[PDB]
Amino acid sequence: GHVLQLESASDKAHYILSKDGNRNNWYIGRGSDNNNDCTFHSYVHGTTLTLKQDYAVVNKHFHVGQAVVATDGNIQGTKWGGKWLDAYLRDSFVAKSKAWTQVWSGSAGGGVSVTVSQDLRFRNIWIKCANNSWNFFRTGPDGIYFIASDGGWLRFQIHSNGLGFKNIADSRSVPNAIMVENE
């Protein structure tokens, strides 16, 4: 069992420094006087690990195998399908946007199909028909849906990959506007 002992005066720096040619290249240890931070530092790369009082720190992005923890707190890895976490989250989970957007307004009587400005499949929508009220519906895929909307009822179709909205038939309940919840 062996120890290579480095000794300095109280509170004075002590580190191991490597120089290649004329160039300071890396060092490890206690780089400054009156300071107990211990550092492993590449002078050439300017890349550094420091052991500090209440935490350890690297001054650049940090990889774990090929995974990346970025200096902005983002994470990239195969678990996130190779995406950055922020994009994986956006794509995987329903946004708590608490906001809505009009995708069409006008008038769509029985048999009338209209174009809407977003893919309305698996969306929260509200359809205004009679009496200036909003009728909630959540759609699935392209298909035929029914709502007992203000005025009577509306049987409607989502088609064209969510970009078509058609009034199949209604009773006294003609759609004149559609909101969708923001994603």
Added chain:
Amino acid sequence: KAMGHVLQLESASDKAHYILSKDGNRNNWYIGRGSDNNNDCTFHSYVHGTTLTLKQDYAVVNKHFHVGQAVVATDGNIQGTKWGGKWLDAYLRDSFVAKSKAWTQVWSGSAGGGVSVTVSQDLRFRNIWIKCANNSWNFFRTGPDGIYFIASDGGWLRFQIHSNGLGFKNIADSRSVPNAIMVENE
């Protein structure tokens, strides 16, 4: 003639072998194999009690780890600018709809035509259930303050969310007087 250089330290593989720095007789830091019969390699500040260790299947720091200014905390939380300067747990809670599979009653009473009531939560963009006739729940998802309609059990109810989601008004109903509102938990 120039070669790679090695400072070779020769020692029994099964015994501790490390470089120790002392300032004024005080153990300050060390690097290397700190214990006998243990191949873990450590970079350790005695003064700070802060440590990096290379173990068999992982590397480990014993305190919060900063990447630039971002922080990976010992509880697995992450703070950084990408999360708006929030901790990830809070960014997530604020950004995505909770799969709470739970609900809470926010009003009980009886609100006939023209009657408005105050509810204990902001009912905007919420999953709600209104009980009217026949002891059944009628689902609705609200948008902002506004006028809504549901052909609720009994007939129908035209209602208003107002006062920044804190007011619920029965505009008109046909045999369908609301007496309870549940909200899905956030």
Added chain:
Amino acid sequence: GHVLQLESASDKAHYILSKDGNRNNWYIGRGSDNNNDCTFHSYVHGTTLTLKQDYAVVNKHFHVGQAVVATDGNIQGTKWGGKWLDAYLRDSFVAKSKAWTQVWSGSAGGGVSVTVSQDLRFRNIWIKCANNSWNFFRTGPDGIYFIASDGGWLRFQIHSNGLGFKNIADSRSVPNAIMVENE
């Protein structure tokens, strides 16, 4: 203030190595010629920290206290209830799946109860009754629900911890299929 100074020619390796005969145990420093990467490496464990030009990297999973950042970008910690983050996220937030599954089909007239393939509590469901249309409903817990579904109306019950679906009564609106939004 002291320095153990290591010197080599320009762009030649310089490192400190601990060994026992031909069994290398660990090294610290610039392990390669013409390469400024600085390394702390256990030969025995094959576990390594490297300071590179644009990042620092460990070659295995990285622990922060007891928390783990895995090489796939996943994260485990007490903040995630002891779960891996991917599981915490799946359990905690509603999936933006945009897809549905059939959980039952048949015919369930007044008073008829059926068993369904999934727990239908707090789910987005669509019930097909009359006129080949889907009627949206979002359920809460086991309980009694009402929808003015295509054909007239349907008062239905979710029971048996989400695995029972019962038509309590309907007017001309007999359920014949139920879809549920994928979790």
